[PDB]
Every structure is written in C-alpha cells, then in structure tokens.
C-alpha cells in the first residue's frame, strides 16, 4: 500500500492534477477513494454529473478543485481509468486536515 502525505486545512480550497487519460479522445473514468466511512466516493463520467459534482469538479486538463476541503474530504483519494483492454492508473494520496475529531 502506497500513499502520499499531503497536509491540508479544513474549509480551505485545494487543487490537484490527476492525469491518466492517454493521447486518445476522452475515454472512460472512475473515481474511487478509501476511508474510514467513505462519503466522498463518486462516479465521474465524461458526459454527466452527480452529487460530488457540487462538492468538487474536474478541470478540462483533468484536474480537481474543491471549494473547501473539510473533515469529510479527509482520507485517501485514488484515480482510475477504464480502456478497451484493462489499462488502469493506480495512485493513492493521503490527505489530512489540521484539527481532527
């Protein structure tokens, strides 16, 4: 198990880039994250949005920006993609806020 140590502040905006999409047209993509309770895991699609869309959006360059990262955003985030064969990208980033419960 591998994870990057990243410090963040509750209610503070945070931006990150999660590449993966090859030189080919916009392919499929799936969002997954591992946490204690997990309440941020949402399904991202190239044509559509859900609840997490209001909590965080993805930039045209394949990035991620959050209006205010709180305790719910804590935990570890992970990116993943789905091609015609099975070439997926693995990456887990550990994020924690200053004051914790």
């Amino acid at each position: 198990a591998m994870a990057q140590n990243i410090t963040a502040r509750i209610g503070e905006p945070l931006v990150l880039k999660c590449k993966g999409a090859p030189k080919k047209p916009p392919q499929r993509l799936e969002w997954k994250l591992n946490t204690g309770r997990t309440e941020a895991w949402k399904v991202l699609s190239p044509q559509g949005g859900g609840p997490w869309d209001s909590v965080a959006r993805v930039l045209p360059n394949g990035s991620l920006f959050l209006p205010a990262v709180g305790i719910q955003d804590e935990g570890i985030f992970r990116c993943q993609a789905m091609n015609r064969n099975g070439k997926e990208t693995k990456s887990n980033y550990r994020v924690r806020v200053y004051q914790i419960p």
Partner: protein
C-alpha cells in the same frame, strides 16, 4: 514456488526486463517489443521486419502505440493456441 508459479513468474520478469528501458516503465514501445520478440522468441530473429511490425500493430488493441501487459497476455495466448493445434494434428 511450484513449477507453474515459477514459469508465470519468469514470463512476467521478461516483460519488465524490457518495458523499463525507455518511455513508460510499465509498457512496451515498438522498440522494446521488437527486441523482446527477437531475443526471447525462438523464431523471433528470423521473422520479416514487416511481419514483426504487423504483429506489434495488432497486439495494440486500445490503439495508443503502447503494448501494455494485457496485450502481452494476448501474445502468450496466441503462442499457446499454436502449440496446442500442432499437437492435435
């Protein structure tokens, strides 16, 4: 490890022996894959350049010019079918 696990382990080790040389560490470029074929396949060094190129082209299913591990498994499956068909007559 048992004979079967050892054989699979050897095949996986070959892939990474060549995939990490240039470009992406976990995929086979046209150069890496041609080298793998010429050095690891019994008849590899005797194949026409045009036929190796066609072989590598077809292995690439997602069409990104890179032969990932899943593509290599397709190659292994093709080799297995060839040997199996010969034995049946």
């Amino acid at each position: 490890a048992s004979p079967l696990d050892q054989a699979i382990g050897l095949l996986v080790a070959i892939f990474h022996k060549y995939s990490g040389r240039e470009g992406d560490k976990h995929t086979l470029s046209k150069k890496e894959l041609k080298e793998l074929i010429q050095k690891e396949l019994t008849i590899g060094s005797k194949l026409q350049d045009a036929e190796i190129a066609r072989l590598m082209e077809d292995l690439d299913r997602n069409k990104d010019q890179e032969v990932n591990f899943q593509e290599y498994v397709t190659f292994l499956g093709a080799l297995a079918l060839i040997y199996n068909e010969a034995l049946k007559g």
